[PDB]
């Protein structure tokens, strides 16, 4: 999983807590 701010895609479910945000986790 990833931590917020660690960039994100759109809905891959990488953010350990929240999810995709402003492009970042």
Swiss-Prot record:
One Gene Ontology cellular component: extracellular region
Chain positions found as Cysteine amide: 25
The keyword Secreted belongs to this UniProt entry's keyword annotation: yes
Annotated positions for site Binds Cav2.2/CACNA1B calcium channel: 4, 10, 13, 17, 19, 21
Molecular functions per Gene Ontology: calcium channel regulator activity; ion channel inhibitor activity; toxin activity
Effect on the protein upon substituting residue 12 to A: In omega-4; 2.11-fold decrease in inhibition of Cav2.2/CACNA1B and decrease in efficacy to kill goldfish (LD(50) is 1.80 mg/kg by intramuscular injection)
Principal location class: secreted
Keyword field: Amidation, Calcium channel impairing toxin, Disulfide bond, Ion channel impairing toxin, Knottin, Neurotoxin, Pharmaceutical, Presynaptic neurotoxin, Secreted, Signal, Toxin, Voltage-gated calcium channel impairing toxin
Expression by tissue: Expressed by the venom duct.
Effect of residue 13 to R: Loss of inhibition of human Cav2.2/CACNA1B
Location in or out of the cell: Secreted
Taxonomy, superkingdom: Eukaryota
Entry keyword Signal: yes
Disulfide bonds: 1-16, 8-20, 15-25
Family indicated by similarity: Belongs to the conotoxin O1 superfamily.
Function: Omega-conotoxins act at presynaptic membranes, they bind and block voltage-gated calcium channels. This toxin blocks Cav2.2/CACNA1B calcium channels (IC(50)=0.67-208 nM). It acts by neutralizing the outer electronegativity and sterically hindering the ion access path to the entrance of the channel selectivity filter. It also shows antiproliferative effects on different glioma cell lines (M059J, U-138MG and U-251MG). In vivo, is lethal to fish. In vivo, injection into mammals induces adverse effects, such as tremor, diminution of spontaneous locomotor activity and bad coordinated locomotion.
Domain notes for this protein: The presence of a 'disulfide through disulfide knot' structurally defines this protein as a knottin.
Protein name per its UniProtKB record: Omega-conotoxin MVIIA
Entire protein: shown range: 46 to 70 of 71
